[PDB]
A paper describes a structure:
The [name] [name] (yeast Tat [transactivator of transcription]-binding analog 7) is a chromatin-associated AAA+ (ATPases associated with various cellular activities) [name] that maintains the balance of nucleosome density of the chromatin. The AAA1 is an active [name], whereas the AAA2 has no [name] activity because of a lack of nucleotide-binding motif. By cryo-EM analysis, here we show that [name] assembles a three-tiered hexamer with a top BRD tier, a middle AAA1 tier, and a bottom AAA2 tier.
We derived two 3D maps, one without H3 N-tail density at an estimated resolution of 5.6 Å and the other with a clear H3 N-tail density at 3.0 Å overall resolution. Accordingly, the 3.0 Å map with bound H3-tail was termed state II. But further 3D classification and focused refinement revealed at a low resolution (9.7 Å) that the BRD tier is in a flat-ring configuration, in which the H3 peptide now could thread into the AAA+ chamber from the center of the ring. The density best fits with the C-terminal 15 residues (Lys10–Lys24) of the added H3 tail, but the best is not perfect for every side chain, indicating that a small population of the H3 peptides in the [name] may be out of register. However, in the ATPγS-bound [name] state II, five ATPγS molecules were identified in the AAA1 domains of subunits B–F. The EM density in the nucleotide-binding pocket of the lowest subunit A is consistent with an ADP, suggesting the ATPγS in this site has been hydrolyzed.
Author numbering:
A (entry chain F): 531 to 624
B (entry chain A): 397 to 530
C (entry chain B): 407 to 735, 756 to 939, 1318 to 1378
D (entry chain C): 401 to 735, 756 to 940, 1318 to 1378
E (entry chain D): 531 to 719
F (entry chain G): 10 to 24
Amino acid sequence: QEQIHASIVSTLLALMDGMDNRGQVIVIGATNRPDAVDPALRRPGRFDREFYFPLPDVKARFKILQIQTRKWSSPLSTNFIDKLAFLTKGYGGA
Amino acid sequence: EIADLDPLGVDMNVNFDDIGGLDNYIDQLKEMVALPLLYPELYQNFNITPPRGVLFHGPPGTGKTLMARALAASCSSDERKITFFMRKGADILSKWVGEAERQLRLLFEEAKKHQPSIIFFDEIDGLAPVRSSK
Amino acid sequence: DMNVNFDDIGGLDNYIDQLKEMVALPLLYPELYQNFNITPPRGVLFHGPPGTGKTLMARALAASCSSDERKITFFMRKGADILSKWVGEAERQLRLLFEEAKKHQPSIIFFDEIDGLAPVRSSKQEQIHASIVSTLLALMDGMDNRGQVIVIGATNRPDAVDPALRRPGRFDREFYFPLPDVKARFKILQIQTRKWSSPLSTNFIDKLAFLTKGYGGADLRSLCTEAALISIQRSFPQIYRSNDKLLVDPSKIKVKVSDFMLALKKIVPSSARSTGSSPQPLPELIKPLLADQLNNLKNKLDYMLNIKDTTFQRNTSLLQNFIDYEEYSYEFFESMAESQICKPRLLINGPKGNGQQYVGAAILNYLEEFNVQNLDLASLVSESSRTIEAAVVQSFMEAKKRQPSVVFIPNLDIWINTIPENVILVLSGLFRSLQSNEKILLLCLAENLDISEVKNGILSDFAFDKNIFQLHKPSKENITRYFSNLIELLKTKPSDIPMKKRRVKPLPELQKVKELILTPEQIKKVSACLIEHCQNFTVSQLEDVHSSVAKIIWKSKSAWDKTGTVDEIIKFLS
Amino acid sequence: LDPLGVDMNVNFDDIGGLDNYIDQLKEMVALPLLYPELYQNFNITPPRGVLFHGPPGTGKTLMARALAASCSSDERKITFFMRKGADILSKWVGEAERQLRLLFEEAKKHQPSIIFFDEIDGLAPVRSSKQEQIHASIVSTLLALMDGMDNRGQVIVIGATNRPDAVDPALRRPGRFDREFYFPLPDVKARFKILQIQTRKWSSPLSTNFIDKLAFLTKGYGGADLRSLCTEAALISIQRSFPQIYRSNDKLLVDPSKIKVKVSDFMLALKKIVPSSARSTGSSPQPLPELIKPLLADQLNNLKNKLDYMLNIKDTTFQRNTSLLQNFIDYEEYSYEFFESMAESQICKPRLLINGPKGNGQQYVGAAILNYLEEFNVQNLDLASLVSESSRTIEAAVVQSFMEAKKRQPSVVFIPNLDIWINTIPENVILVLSGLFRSLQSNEKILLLCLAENLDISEVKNGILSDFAFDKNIFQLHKPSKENITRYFSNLIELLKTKPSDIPMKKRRVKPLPELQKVTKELILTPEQIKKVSACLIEHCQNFTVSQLEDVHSSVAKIIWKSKSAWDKTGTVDEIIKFLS
Amino acid sequence: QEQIHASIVSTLLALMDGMDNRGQVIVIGATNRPDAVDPALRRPGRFDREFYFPLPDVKARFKILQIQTRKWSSPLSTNFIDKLAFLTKGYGGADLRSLCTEAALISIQRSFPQIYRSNDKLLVDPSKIKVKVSDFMLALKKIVPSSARSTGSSPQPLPELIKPLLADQLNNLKNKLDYMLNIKDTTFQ
Amino acid sequence: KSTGGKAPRKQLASK
Ligand SMILES: Nc1ncnc2c1ncn2[C@@H]1O[C@H](COP(=O)(O)OP(=O)(O)OP(O)(O)=S)[C@@H](O)[C@H]1O
Ligand SMILES: Nc1ncnc2c1ncn2[C@@H]1O[C@H](COP(=O)(O)OP(=O)(O)OP(O)(O)=S)[C@@H](O)[C@H]1O
Ligand SMILES: Nc1ncnc2c1ncn2[C@@H]1O[C@H](COP(=O)(O)OP(=O)(O)O)[C@@H](O)[C@H]1O
Ligand SMILES: [Mg+2]
C-alpha cells in the first residue's frame, strides 16, 4: 500500500470516531467490492450497517424495463415487457 | 506504521450497566483488567499475575463484542484509558501468508506500546483454526 | 519480562547442568575446552508438553550467566514473526538477527515454536518456507563461524522441525521437558508460594502435590494465582462492586486450604483437556472395592517391570552421580540388569462394568516414570487429517523414542471390534520388532473379553500368555467397607453437616483513598439388607446402589429422627 | 572473537573419507591455472560446476571451507564468494536478479573466482507456474548467467544441498553444475579416520583398537555426529574429573592435565548420542547384542558368509578405491574390457528369505545383517514405514522406496515380518513391487532381504511370493542347539557365583569433595549345586526358541539379582530349582 | 501472480505485433519450458516459427562427437565413434561435450599423475598424452547425462554378455518393427 | 501467496 492512502484511512477513522453521539452527520459509502475496503472502517462505530444491492429478480426487471420504456413515442405492450423480463435472468438495470 | 494498527475508538455509552444476564463474567473480568490497574499493591503481595487471556464463546448476538467494548469503557477513566484494538478472522489479508504475521507482530507491538490494552479477535477460529483439519 | 534464575525452576536439574557446560563453562574456562580442541555445543531443542518450563528455562539461562563482567544478550523470536510478504526481507531479517547476535558475541537466540518457523521442507508448500529454512540452516552451520551464539528452540512436537536442523552444529542436543512428578510439583508449589506473606505448611503443600496429578507448571502457576484471587474475593469483596478505589490492608488476606480446593475445582490441566485417559489415583470411595485387586496388580508390575530394584539405573543426572558417588576402580553387569525385562505385557480382563476405568488410571498413576502413549479409539480418530494406521505407528514411535513407556489400550474388547485387523497386524509387527530388554509395557484393559482371541485369535501375536490378570467381583468384606461410609453419613448429626450459613450482619465498609436418634439394631438391619441386596455385584452395580442410598440419605440431611430415612432405604433395596 | 568456534584454516587432510572428491576438486580450481596448455591441447573446457549433495553434517560445507582456506594461500589469487540460501534476494523484487547478476559480474571481475551457493535448493527450486514468478525468474537469471551466450569467465560455481531433486533440472547440466559429488554417511574406514582426526591433538590419545571399536559401535553417524561423540566424551570426562566447577559461579583453579578421557566416558557418550540419521525415525540397526551372541552368532556367521558370497562383498578387486589418482600412482597400467563384464556378471539375483519359528530372534538377525551391509542403501518396506504417512499412499511408498533403492546402488530392500507383511499388504501392491524388480538387469546389486516367522514353502513355490525368485535363497533359522544354550546360561551361572565385593555397586563418598580454590568371607556355593542348576536350566529349555530362552533367562536373572549381596547363594539355587521345575 | 509480469507480457505483445510496425527486427527466444510462455506470444506475427531442438539421435550424436574430437592431435577411429554414439542414448550435446572432456581428463590424470600431487608447474610434455578406449569407457561409467539425473536412466541396448542369447530374436523384432512402422525412413528423410 | 513491492513512489513534488 502507498503512504498517502494509508494516511487517508488513518484520518477518516479518527474523523468517524470523532463524530458525536447525537447523530446529525451520516456518511454513506458505496462499493462494488466490499472486502476491498480497509477492515478498520467496518468495525463498530464506523461503517457498520450495510445494504446489499443484488441483481434484480423477474418482477424487478419488469419494473426496470417499464421505467426505461416510459417516454417513448410509440409504446410497448406489457406482455412483451413481461417476456423480456423472463429472458434476462442476470441483467442489472444498466 | 502502515498496517491495521488503529485503536478502535470506544464510546462511553457502553458499560456493564448496559449488559444483561452475564454478571459472573463481568465479576471475573474486573479482576482480570480493572483491579490489577486499580489495586496493584494487592496482586504484588501474592506476586500473582492476572490472566491476560479469555475466550468468549457462544451463539451470535449474545454479547461477546458488547462485553469486550464495555470492558474497554469500564476502566477508561481517571485520565487512564484502555486502548482497544479489534481485529477479525474474516479479513481478506488475515490468511495472507507473509503479510499476516507482519500485521500480527505490529498489532502486538502497538498493543504493548499503549500499555493497558485490549485486543479483541472477533472470529478467532478464522485466524487460529485446528491444524488437524481437512 | 521478569527476572528469573535457575532457582525459579523446579525439577529440571539435569538439564540445567547440561546447559551450564554449553553457555557458561566455555566462558569461564575456555582453556578446558581447547585442551581437547572441542567446540562447545551451542544448539538445543527444548521439547515436550506445553506449560513445562521451556521459555522459563530459556529466560533463566540468559539471566543466570549474565553478571558484572559478561553480559549474555538475549534474543527472542516468536514462531515465524520474522516473515514479510517478500521472502527476501525475511531473509535479511534473519541475517541481521544473526549478525547482531554475533556483534554481542556472548548471546542466546530463542526461537519459540520453531516448528512454525522451520517446518520440514517440501515442494508441495510455498517457497517462502523452504527459503527461510535454507537460510536458517546456512546461518546456524555455514562456511563461516557464527560466533558465540547459542540457538535455543522450543516446540511441542520435535518431528515437525526440518531434520537438517536436528544435527550436531545446530540444535546439537534435544531436551524433553516432561510433566512434573510429585517431587517436582512439590518444588514448583514451593517456588510459587515462597514470596507469600503467610506461607503454606509442608503437609498441605504435599497434599497439594498429590492432588495436582496431571498439572504442568503453567497449571500450578494458574492454580496458585486463582487461589490467591479467591482469597481476595473472600476477604474484601467490596472492591468488586465499587467504581473507584477503596481502602484495603494486605495484612488480612491469607490463602486458606478451602481457596485451594475451590481453585482445584475450576482449574483444568492440559492432561485433563487431552483425549486419552488421565492417570488419577484410585478414588477414595471405590478404594475399598478395588484396593485389594489393584494392590495385586502393583506387585505384578513390580515383578515384570523391575520398579523396586533401581540399583544401576539411578541416573537422575550424570553429574549428580559424580558429585556424591565414586568412580569404580566389567560392565556386563548392566546387561544382566537390562536382561530382567523380557517382554512386559499385561492384559487386565474382568466382567462388564467392574471398575476397569479406575484400575487402568490407577495403574498409570503407579507408573509415574513412564511415558504413557494412548491407543484408545478416541485418541486415534481425534486428529482429522491423520489416518488410524499412521496414528498407531506415531503412537508406537513416541513410545519407542522415550523409554520406559506404556502403550495403553483401554476398552480392548471394543478396540478389536472397531480397529481394522490390518492395524492390529501393524501393531503386532511393531511389537515383534522390539529387543526383549526394551521397556515398553503393553497394557490393555478389557471387559468380558474371551480367552479365545488371545490364544488363537487376533491377539495371539502380542503374547498375553501368562500375563492375563482377572479383575474379579469385590468380596463381601470389601462391600462392607464400601457401605460403611454411607452409614457413617447416615450417622452424622445435622450439626456436623456443613450448612452454607447466612450472615448475621452485613460486611463492614471500606473507605475511599439434641439427640440424633438411631438405634444400632436398626443400623445392623440396613447393613444386613445392603449386603443381602448386593450379591455378586460388579463395581458399577455397587455404585448404583450407593448412589441411590446416598440420594435417600442426603434428602434428610437435617432431620434428627433418622427412622423414616432407614425405612426408605430398606424400602428401596427390595 | 570466538576462540572456541569453528576454525576456518582447515586443510584438506582434516576431511576423512572423501579423497576422490578432493582430487577431483583440485583439477577444477588448481590444474587449469597451472597447466592451461593441457586443456588447450584438446579443445576441452574444464568442468567449472559441481553440486555437493548428501546427508547433513557429511562435510559438504566442510569441503567448501577447506577449499576456501586452500584458495587463501600464496602464488594463486582465487577470490571466494560465499552465498547462503537465498541471501541474494534483495529487499524489493525488481532487484533480486539484479543482485544475482551483480554477483557473477563481480565474480567475472576477480577473474579466478569461486562462488559457493550453500543450500542452493532454497535459492533455485524447480521452476513452477503455480509457485511464484520470482522464484522462476531467479532460476532463469541463474541459468542464463552460468552459460548464456557470453562467457561467464573463470568462475567455478559450487552448490550444496541435501535435497538435489529440489534443484531445477536445467541447472544440473555440464556448463553450470557438470559434476555431482555424493557425500555419503561414512563407512567404517572413514568413521575410523574421522575419529582419528577429532582425537589427534588430545593430550593422552585414544588407542587404535579402541578407535576401531568406536568406529564399529557408531553406525549411521556422520562426521558431525562423530565430532559430537568426541565432544560429549570430553565433557563427561571433565565433569567426572572436576565436578566442582558446575556448582560454583566464580572461577575455580582447574588444570586440564589431570583430565584424561577414558573408555567409559565414550561409552556414556554413546548411550546418549542420537545420530542425525536416527532423530526423525526411531534409531539405527545395531549389531547382535552381547547376551544373545551365543544363541545366534553361529547362524549369523553362516548368513554372513552366504551374503558376501552372493553379493561379492569380501573381494572388491575393482571397487572400494580410496582415490583413483593413487590408483594411477601406485598401480601400473595394462597397455577387451569384458573382464569388467565377467566381473559384474557375478551378481545374478540377490534374494534372501530368512525363515524360522515364531520367536527365534528374527529382529536381531535382521538388524545384525543390516549392520554387516555398510555400503548398502537400506530401504525399509515394513508396514510401519509404508503406513506412517497419511498423505502418501502405500502404493506410492513402495514405488518411491524401490526407486530410491534403484537410484543409489548397492541397496537392500528390507522386508521384516514378511509373514505379517503378506497378510496386511494388499495383493496388487505385492504384484507392483515384483514388477519393479523384474525391470532391473540381473547384475543390478539390489538385494531383496526378507525375514519371516513360520512362513511355509507353499507361499514361496506357488503363491504371491512366487514372482520373487526365492527358490534357492531360503535360509532356515534353527532353534538354538544345546551347546548354544549352555553357553547362553553359563554367563548367568557366572552371575550366580560372583563375589558381592565385585559387583560394580559404586559407593557414596564418605568424605566431602576435595574442594577447589577460587582464583583471582566367601560364597557358600557348592560346585555340585552349580552343576545341578545348570542341568535343570538346560533340560528345562529343551527345544526352545530364542525368545523363550530370553524368558527363562530373564526370570532366573531376576531370582539371582535379588540375592546379589548375600554371601550364601544356597537359598538362591533351591529358589531357581523351585521356579523351573 | 503480480502485475509486473502480466504488464511485461502485455508490453511485449504490443511491441511485437501492435499498432506500430516493429521494423526488420528478428526476435528469438530460447526456452526449456515453452508452455510457460504466454500463448498469445506463440502465434504468427510474433514467434511465427518454433524450432524444436531434440536430444540428438544416433547420427547426430556421431556428428557431435566428431565435432568434439576434431582438433585432437591423436584422432579417434570412426568405428569407435560409432560405438560411442550407440552407447549414449539420452545424452545431449552438453553431455557428449562433457564425455569427451572427462575422457581427456582421465587420460591426463593417467599419463602425468605426479602433477595432481604438486603445487607448482612440473614441465608436462603435452604431446605424449593420448585418449584411449579405456579412458572413454571409464568416462562413460562416470557420467550421468542431464536427462537422467532426476529420473532413472535411459533404456540401454542389449548387454554385451547375454547378446548371444537374445540378439537373433531382437533382430527379428527389429525387422518386424521396421516393416510395421517404416523405421528406415523409406525415401522420406 | 507472498510477493513484494516496488520501493515507494518518489513524490518529486518540486514542480
Ligand atoms: N518446571 C517449572 N518450574 C517452575 N515454574 C514453572 C515450571 N514450568 C512452568 N513454570 C511456570 O509456569 C509458567 C509457564 O510458562 P512456560 O512454562 O515457560 O511455558 P512453556 O510451555 O514452557 O513454553 P511456551 O509454551 O513456549 S510459553 C512459567 O512462566 C513459570 O512461571
Ligand atoms: N568427512 C568429514 N571429516 C571430518 N570432519 C567431518 C566430516 N564431515 C563432517 N565433519 C565434521 O562435522 C561438521 C559438520 O559438517 P558440515 O560440512 O557442516 O555438514 P554439511 O554437509 O554441510 O551438512 P548440512 O547439509 O549443511 S546440515 C564439520 O564442521 C566437521 O567438523
Ligand atoms: N446479552 C446481552 N445483553 C445486552 N445487550 C445485548 C446482549 N447481546 C447483544 N446485545 C445487543 O446486541 C448488540 C450486538 O451483539 P454482539 O455483541 O455483536 O453479539 P456477538 O458478540 O455475538 O457478535 C450489542 O451491541 C448489544 O447492544
Ligand atoms: Mg553445511
